[PDB]
Amino acid sequence: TSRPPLEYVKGVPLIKYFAEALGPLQSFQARPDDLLISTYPKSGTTWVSQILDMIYQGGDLEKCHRAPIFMRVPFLEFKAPGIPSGMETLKDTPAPRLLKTHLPLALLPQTLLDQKVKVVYVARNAKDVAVSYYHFYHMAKVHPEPGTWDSFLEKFMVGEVSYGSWYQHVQEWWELSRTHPVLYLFYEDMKENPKREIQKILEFVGHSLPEETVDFMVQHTSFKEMKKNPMTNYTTVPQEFMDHSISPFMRKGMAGDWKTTFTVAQNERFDADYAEKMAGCSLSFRSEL
Ligand SMILES: Nc1ncnc2c1ncn2[C@@H]1O[C@H](COP(=O)(O)O)[C@@H](OP(=O)(O)O)[C@H]1O
Ligand SMILES: N#Cc1cc2ccc(O)cc2oc1=O
């Protein structure tokens, strides 16, 4: 098998190479002017990464094409054979740095909280996440075999997928936001009103840009622009690692398209389980626009 099993670390199932990567990651030192992009997988990481990097380049799109987003925004825990690790990439990254992770809080380098690093967190509704992830598993060959949609959806509801439970991830980081600087966004809000969300990000990172530059960012962070941009669309990675003919990384970009995959039986079982897991939480997600 080329698709190795998940390895559990402190309760969290992880890609095996990412588990190994936690070793060198232990020596990682955060700076006070770092910013961390944190998400459960498939919730808009790449989207918000492109947004934050354009802001960092003061809107200059030629600066944003300097390299693929994975090299401009180092992925902390990342590693795979014949690809440079997130830690190796990080050492050539100039400050102020943007950093990406999907780690639950129980694996997050303590340095990031100690240093009070600003967090941009993005949450997305669980149903869209699930569908997105199922397809991602097929094209991104470091994951184990996804199986049928039905058996993947059952694993997703118990957290037996890479990075574990969606339900715990979005709650723990929601709770963290009351004691650490976290801007907590929803993919759906960004779909609804991208300009509004970008203005929130701007206020959060303490920058100012003219209306015209903001409007130029909305354009270049749209699904369509990001899909054809080879610096955001992951098409330059080796086909041994991601195969786009199986499923593109920039797949649909919709809120609400889970309706086209979930059967009615799956939906009813998912809803009942979801109300149990999310009962004590004050988060309200939108499943569609
Ligand atoms: N500019 C954009 N607008 C809306 N969705 C975007 C986007 N850029 C990427 N995405 C979507 O974000 C999801 C992947 O997120 P991550 O970057 O966290 O892996 C994919 O969702 P779909 O598979 O629903 O299309 C991808 O298509
Ligand atoms: N193989 C593989 C990959 C897994 C992966 C997991 C999470 C993520 O945010 C990005 C990723 O990019 C990859 O190329």
Numbering used by the authors: 7 to 295
What text comes from the article?
The cytosolic sulfotransferase (SULTs) family catalyzes the transfer of a sulfate group from the universal 3′-phosphoadenosine 5′-phosphosulfate (PAPS) donor to a wide variety of acceptor molecules bearing a hydroxyl or an amine group. Sulfonation results in inactivation of the majority of acceptors, including neurotransmitters, steroid hormones and drugs, thus modulating their biological activity and rendering the product more soluble and readily excretable. Of these, the SULT1 family is the largest and is responsible for the sulfonation of phenol, thyroid and steroid hormones, as well as a variety of xenobiotics and known drugs. For example, SULT1A1 displays substrate preference for small phenolic compounds, while SULT1E1 shows a preference for estrogen acceptors.
We determined SULT1A1 structures in complex with PAP and one or two molecules of the 3CyC acceptor (SULT1A1-PAP-3CyC1 and SULT1A1-PAP-3CyC2, respectively). The SULT1A1-PAP-3CyC2 was probably formed due to drop dehydration leading to increased 3CyC concentration. These structures allowed us to examine the changes undergone by SULT1A1 upon binding of one versus two 3CyC molecules. Our SULT1A1 structures in complex with one or two 3CyC molecules provide new insights into the structural basis of SULT1A1 substrate inhibition. Comparison between the two structures shows a dramatic movement of Phe247 allowing the exposure of a conserved binding site for the second 3CyC molecule. Our determined SULT1A1 structures in complex with one or two 3CyC acceptor molecules indicate that the formation of the binding site for the second 3CyC molecule (3Cyc-2) is probably induced upon binding of the first molecule to the enzyme active site. In contrast, kinetic analysis of the activity towards 3CyC indicated no inhibition at high substrate concentrations for the WT and the mutant proteins. WT SULT1A1 exhibited a much higher KM of ∼20 µM for 3CyC, relative to the pNP, in accordance with the role of SULT1A1 in the sulfonation of small phenolic substrates.
